[PDB]
């Protein structure tokens, strides 16, 4: 009765912070964070919808719709759901495979543009369905398999992949869709083979914009104590570039790529094309895994920093519901990006309200100044993206820590980074997880099982399992008229451990060495008595080492 | 210098027991075991060459050739390499897929029989190459992953599969090659659909032979103390059945299947058809894995019973070399069977000489009485096989032990048996291994990490890793002006453990609780000092609990 109501209330985390909303504190920083996040989301959506080989207008919908669903069903406070180019790079494979370039209407867009957004929407819907399906299980309670070095290496490799996917806009050249197990080097080979087609105007503009952005963003952070605000350099740069492009004929005099139409939209929702759900299984799995792990890392970091507890299983439901609901409005797969979380940290956001004022501003942009973004050069947008990827790219400094701490996760980090830079992000994540599991499995047979205490007393550590049964037998045999075994920490065992213990007892009896147990539990006592046919009228199992010592003096 | 010679001598284990061969003791039981094993090998080879959809004459070569190679390069004493129907069931898939029945000379055999033995030889060669390849690595030092319940369940399921593959001979009907993910039930469905074609004569003969064999083999074992020998009932039954078939016209008067030609052979060796090595990858992997695990189980059992030590990596080289060498003589994949090991145990064999007298007798059979086995009915051979599978089929009694000991390997046994009876032996083995690894991984976060000793002292058990870092933090936080941590067993850690320890120390300092370490090693001390920026001029790390207690009194 009441338990069901409590469960239902626990599945709606918006009821825990909405009635407790402070108006004196969390209204001005929330609004400022909302405006900054709105600008960030607009830019990132426009830049990452193109990265997925999809018309840029759908990036606004992908940055607007899932945010509300996450706000309703999400537990993280400083998590802003958006486009997350990592998933765009995965969806682009399916989009370009199902509908390639050779075959070149609800919003006035020409055909061959619907056939790509339909594939993207199907991918997002399947990813959301998968996320909800592993939410209804207890998946999420087992998320310790993914480790900090693995996520760091995968994110750094994906950031490098995104950086190398924007050079075709900074230089101004045109490239075909190159992807595969070694596309990172093929892209540079193509760039260097056609080095005579690089436009100087686009390169100079990109260099100037990058220098200005880096200088402003560094000087603002260095002297944050004197100016207690965040300078909106991106908006000023965008406005200046657009006005310079419009006031001149820079579209025609110099060959430059600009954002095409961005029509006023939000059309009627339509169901995804369920008939192609069988051709996008791998993309859906990759999206549903990488987006979830990347968002969960940020949510856990926020929870640790701001001293609150989250649930690793509610994020599954939140992300799955957001993807499923947003798939009906022609949206690409969605997740949480590190840049928006860093911006929220810097501005000083407090609650999830800042993710709704940004939605309001995105709606205003969609319905009011949609056609006003025609004169924005693509070089400026690419420079903004590569500057914003600084937080992801700076993670190379963790190598010193991993080298000075363990020297084993250093190798895992290097291997995961290499595999991510070669094949892809999802392959790198899978390789890192498998390598971590194999390494932790292979270390058990090479560790000492028993310890010697100052008639000898020998203490067992704990997990006497099939991983370290033969090693335990070897360690105990290499250590020999009496012998006491302290099984205090020993609580975790299986058939192999019991068999090895009984064999040890039998062999020690053969060598005329008596073995007495000290702190055996009830289940272990029952199992050892059954397996070895031990009589209950002979003192073997005791309750403490002192009791065994007292029994010795007889 | 000398180390290389020692390594080379260690790769030839025949030099350790040949010069030390006793002639007074190990000559009569070795000869008796040799004769019995020769009869066993002849029967099993003739019955398992047909099971692989291959002419029965090659079973003799498969039982003769690899035995010598194993004797030279093998470590087990009571291990007799042979045909091992488990591998025949796997090779039959490739044989029937590459060369199906619809297309129906070195030894006078007709065509379409060379195209099948070539595929079988290629499969065996690839399996041997794979086994040697994982021998040149250090694979074999990691064989603890496979557990006793998994091997028992896989062997029982394979024995049931072999039993259900011999009903078409006991009944006398004819069946097409049925195989797949559910062939076990399809075979019985076909049998029951054509129940009107069952021959009564073959059924009666099979029933009489089964009853006689079971009664003799039970009465010989029950009263072994009065008669100190092993009754050769199989040879007497074979001779009687052959003479009854020849003296009558049982081939013509009643429809009966008999062994066809068995020509005098051992032709010139020929290389396998390397051009089809790409179509038999899965079969080769399955054979090389299941044969090795099944032979290693028997070798380890013999070593444990007879008190000698073997190497888990030399068996790889022995089996790989045996398969590679025997592939050039038109042989099916080879491994070790449990029935021959049980026969060697019962007879009283002592060394590997008993595996060479059997080879001599098999050679004599091949070159002398090859054509004399024409009049042996197939029902008698199938009955002999199903009677000999008793040792494998009796393993159902381990369920009581697994239920009374752990109740978790009981579920693993049941699941592995079900998956083996449904799909196949190799799929069942893979499922069992994966399930065991996943179960042992998932148990770590649910076990208590720290223990309380009788200013409180708390002892850490040992593997502070990513599996149980959050659980360790929760356990330590649920247990709170002073606190001592005994890291005596603690020797196995990584980055996650160090991070959790430092976070625990920081949080306890925040709660005004002092944490003092007791038995930290050098590497752990260095890592914890680097990670937490701990000053070396403050007493934190000690050498014993008594030292910490003495430091307290100040």
Q: Are B440 and A465 within 8 A, CB to CB? A: yes
Based on the domain organization, do A359 and A252 belong to the same domain? yes
How many distinct structural domains can be found in chain B?
2
SS (H, E, C) B204-250: HHHHHHHHHHHHHHHHHHHCCCCCCCCCCHHHHHHHHHHHHHHHCCC
Closest to A448 (Cβ–Cβ): which among B402, B444, B491? B491
User: What CATH number has the domain bearing residue B479?
Assistant: 3.30.750.24
Chain A's closest residue to B488, CA to CA, is A451
Q: A316 near A140, Cβ under 8 Å?
A: yes
Q: Are residues B397 and B498 in the same domain?
A: no
Q: Report the C-alpha gap between A82 and A78 in whole angstroms.
A: 13
How far is Cα A316 from Cα B61, in angstroms, rounded to an integer? Answer: 60
Question: Which residue of B407, B446, B489 is the best one to mutate when testing the A interface, meaning the one whose CB has the most A CBs within 10 A?
Answer: B489
Q: Is residue B186 part of a domain?
A: no
Lookup: tokens for A532: 């070895």
Let me know if residue B522 belongs to a domain: yes
The pair of three-digit structure tokens given for residue B213, joined into one six-digit string: 């064999």
Helices (H), B11-147: 28-51, 57-73, 85-98, 114-136
φ, ψ at B208 (rounded to 5°): -65, -45
Q: Which of B393, B416, B437 is the last residue of a domain?
A: B437
User: A347 and A399 in contact (C-beta within 8 Å)?
Assistant: no
Q: Does B506 touch chain A (CB under 8 A)?
A: no
Q: Are residues B346 and B490 in the same domain?
A: no
B10 belongs to a structural domain: no
* Cα A232 to Cα A343: distance, rounded to the nearest angstrom: 11
Phi/psi class of residue B457: alpha, beta or left (left: φ > 0; alpha: ψ in -120 to 50)?
beta
Interface of A with B in 158-197 (CB under 8 A): none
Q: What is the 3-state secondary structure (H, E, C) of B379-414?
A: HHHHHHHHHHCHHHHHHHHHHHHHHHHCCCHHHHHH
Boundary of a domain, candidates B386, B418, B437: B437
Cβ–Cβ gap A461/B461 under 8 Å: yes
Strands A335-336 and A81-82: antiparallel
Q: Is the separation of the CB atoms in A283 and A91 below 8 Å?
A: yes
And the tokens for A343? 């911006």
What does DSSP assign to residue B493?
Answer: B
Are A217 and A300 in the same domain?
Answer: yes
Q: How many CB pairs (< 8 A) connect A and B?
A: 113
Does residue A400 form part of some domain? no
Residue owning tokens 């008796």:
B32
Q: Which residues of A touch B437 (CB under 8 A)?
A: 437, 441
Angle, alpha carbons B201-B206-B212 (nearest 5°)? 125
Residues of B in contact with A530 (CB under 8 A): 404-405
Instruction: Confirm whether A280 is domain-assigned.
Output: yes
Same domain membership, residue B155 and residue B223:
yes
CA B107 from centre of chain: 34
B residues 513-552 lying closer than 8 A (beta carbon) to A = 527, 530-531
Q: Give the residue from B421, B478, B429, B479 showing the smallest Cα distance to B453.
A: B479
B505 belongs to a structural domain = yes
| Neighbouring residues of A548: CB distance < 8 A, sequence distance ≥ 6 | A484, A516, A518, A542
Q: B489 and A437 in contact by Cβ < 8 A?
A: no
Indicate the resolution in Å. Answer: 3.2
Secondary structure of A186-226 as H, E, C letters: HHHHHHHHCHHHCCHHHHHHHHHHHHHHHHHHHHHHHCCCC
**Domain endpoint, select from B409, B437, B465:** B437
Beta bridge partners of A466: none
| 3-class state of residue B458 by DSSP | strand
Interface contact A452, partner B, CB < 8 A: no
Distance set, CA B394 to CA A134, B159, B388 (Å): 41, 10, 11
Question: For A483, which DSSP code?
Answer: E
Distance, in Å, from the CA atom of A523 to the CA atom of A507, rounded to the nearest integer, reads 23
Residue A218 class from Cβ within 10 Å (0-12 exposed, 13-18 middle, 19+ buried)? exposed
A364 and A497 housed in the same domain:
no
- Same domain? B363 vs B502: no
Both A107 and A186 in a single domain?
Answer: yes
Discontinuities in chain B (C→N > 2.5 Å), after residue: 104, 454, 480
B452 and B404, same domain (yes or no): no
CA distances from B209 to B168, B213, B243 (A): 16, 6, 15
- Distance of alpha carbon B161 from alpha carbon A253, whole angstroms: 79
Instruction: Report helix, strand or coil for A484.
Output: strand
Nearest CA in chain B to A526: B405
Residue A178 main-chain phi, psi, to 5 deg: -110, 120
Q: Which residue of B has its CA nearest to A447?
A: B492
Q: Is A520 left (phi over 0), alpha (psi -120 to 50) or beta?
A: beta
d(CA A143, CA B299): 40
Alpha carbon of A339 to those of A78, A156, A319, B352: distances in Å?
11, 13, 19, 70
* Distance from C-alpha of A268 to C-alpha of B461, rounded to nearest angstrom: 61
What torsion, rounded to 10 degrees, do the Cα atoms B423, B429, B435, B439 define?
A: 150
Quick check: is A392 in a domain?
A: no
- Contact check, Cβ <8 Å, A408/B436: no
A140 and A289 share a domain? Answer: yes
**Domain span holding position B361:** 25-102+111-174+192-260+275-437
Give a yes or no: residue B14 inside a domain.
Answer: no
Contact between chains at A488 and B451 (C-beta distance less than 8 A): yes
Query: Are A466 and B436 a contacting pair at CB < 8 A?
Result: yes
Cα gap B350→B344, rounded to integer Å: 9
Q: Per the structure block, which two tokens stand in for B162?
A: 């072999």
Q: Which residues pair with B258 in a beta bridge?
A: B377
In this structure, the answer to whether residues B222 and B86 fall within a common structural domain is yes
Say whether both A203 and A318 belong to one domain: yes
Two tokens at B471? 């659980």
Q: Two tokens at B465?
A: 């890793």
Residue B356, judged by CB atoms within 10 A of its CB (0-12, 13-18, 19+), counts as middle
How far apart (Å, rounded) are the C-alpha atoms in residues A437 and A434? 5
Q: How far are the Cα atoms of A27, A54, B291, B377 from residue B295, in angstroms, in the given order?
A: 73, 58, 6, 31
A417-422's contacts with Cβ under 8 Å and 24+ in sequence apart are: A417/A153, A417/A156, A417/A157, A419/A157, A420/A153, A420/A154, A420/A156, A420/A157, A420/A158, A420/A161, A421/A157, A421/A160, A421/A161, A421/A184, A422/A181, A422/A182, A422/A184
């Amino acid at each position: 009765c009441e338990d069901i109501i409590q469960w239902c209330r626990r599945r709606l985390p918006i009821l825990d912070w909405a009635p407790h909303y402070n108006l004196k504190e969390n209204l001005l920083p929330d609004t400022v964070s909302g405006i900054m996040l709105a600008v960030q989301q607009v830019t990132q959506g426009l830049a990452f919808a193109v990265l997925s080989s999809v018309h840029p207008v759908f990036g606004l919908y992908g940055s607007l719709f899932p945010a509300i669903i996450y706000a309703i069903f999400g537990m993280g406070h400083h998590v802003a759901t958006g486009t997350f180019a990592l998933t765009s790079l995965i969806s682009a494979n399916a989009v370009e495979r199902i509908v390639p370039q050779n075959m070149q209407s609800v919003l006035g867009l020409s055909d061959f543009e619907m056939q790509r957004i339909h594939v993207a929407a199907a991918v997002s819907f399947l990813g959301g369905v998968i996320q909800v399906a592993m939410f209804v299980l207890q998946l999420g309670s087992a998320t310790f398999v993914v480790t900090e070095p693995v996520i760091s290496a995968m994110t750094t490799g994906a950031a490098t992949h995104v950086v190398t996917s924007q050079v075709k806009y900074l230089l101004g050249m045109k490239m075909p869709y190159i992807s595969g197990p070694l596309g990172f080097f093929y892209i540079y080979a193509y760039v260097f083979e056609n080095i005579k087609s690089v436009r100087l105007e686009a390169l100079l503009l990109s260099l100037l914009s990058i220098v200005v952005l880096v200088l402003v963003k560094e000087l603002n952070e260095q002297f944050k104590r004197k100016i207690k605000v965040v300078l909106p350099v991106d908006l000023v740069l965008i406005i200046a570039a657009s006005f310079a492009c419009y006031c001149t004929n820079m579209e025609n005099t110099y060959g430059l790529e600009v954002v095409g139409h961005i029509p006023q939209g939000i059309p009627s929702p339509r169901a995804p094309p369920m008939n192609i759900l069988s051709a996008v299984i791998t993309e859906a799995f990759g999206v549903a895994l990488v987006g979830y792990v990347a968002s969960l890392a940020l949510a856990q970091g926020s929870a640790k920093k701001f001293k609150y507890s989250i649930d690793d299983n509610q994020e599954f439901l939140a992300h799955g519901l957001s993807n499923i609901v947003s798939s009906f409005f022609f949206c690409i797969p969605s997740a949480a990006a590190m840049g928006r979380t860093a911006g929220l940290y810097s501005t000083g956001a407090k609650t999830q309200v800042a993710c709704l004022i940004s939605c309001i501003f995105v709606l205003i942009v969609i319905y009011a100044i949609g056609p006003l973004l025609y004169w924005l050069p693509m070089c400026v947008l690419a420079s903004i993206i590569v500057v914003g990827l600084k937080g992801m790219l700076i993670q190379f400094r963790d190598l010193k820590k991993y080298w000075n701490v363990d020297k084993i996760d250093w190798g895992i980090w290097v291997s995961t980074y290499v595999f991510t830079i070669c094949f892809a992000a999802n392959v790198g994540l899978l390789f890192g997880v498998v390598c971590t599991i194999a390494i932790v499995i292979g270390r058990f047979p090479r560790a000492m099982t028993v310890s010697i205490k100052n008639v000898k007393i020998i203490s067992i550590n704990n997990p006497l399992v099939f991983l370290n049964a033969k090693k335990f037998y070897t360690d105990l045999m290499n250590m020999i008229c009496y012998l006491i075994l302290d099984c205090s920490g020993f609580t975790f065992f299986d058939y192999s451990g019991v068999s090895m213990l009984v064999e040890v007892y039998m062999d020690c009896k053969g060598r005329s060495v008596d073995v007495l147990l000290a702190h055996c539990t009830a289940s272990l006592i029952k199992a050892m008595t059954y397996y070895g046919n031990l009589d209950s009228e002979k003192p073997i199992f005791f309750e403490s080492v002192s009791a065994a010592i007292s029994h010795i003096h007889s």
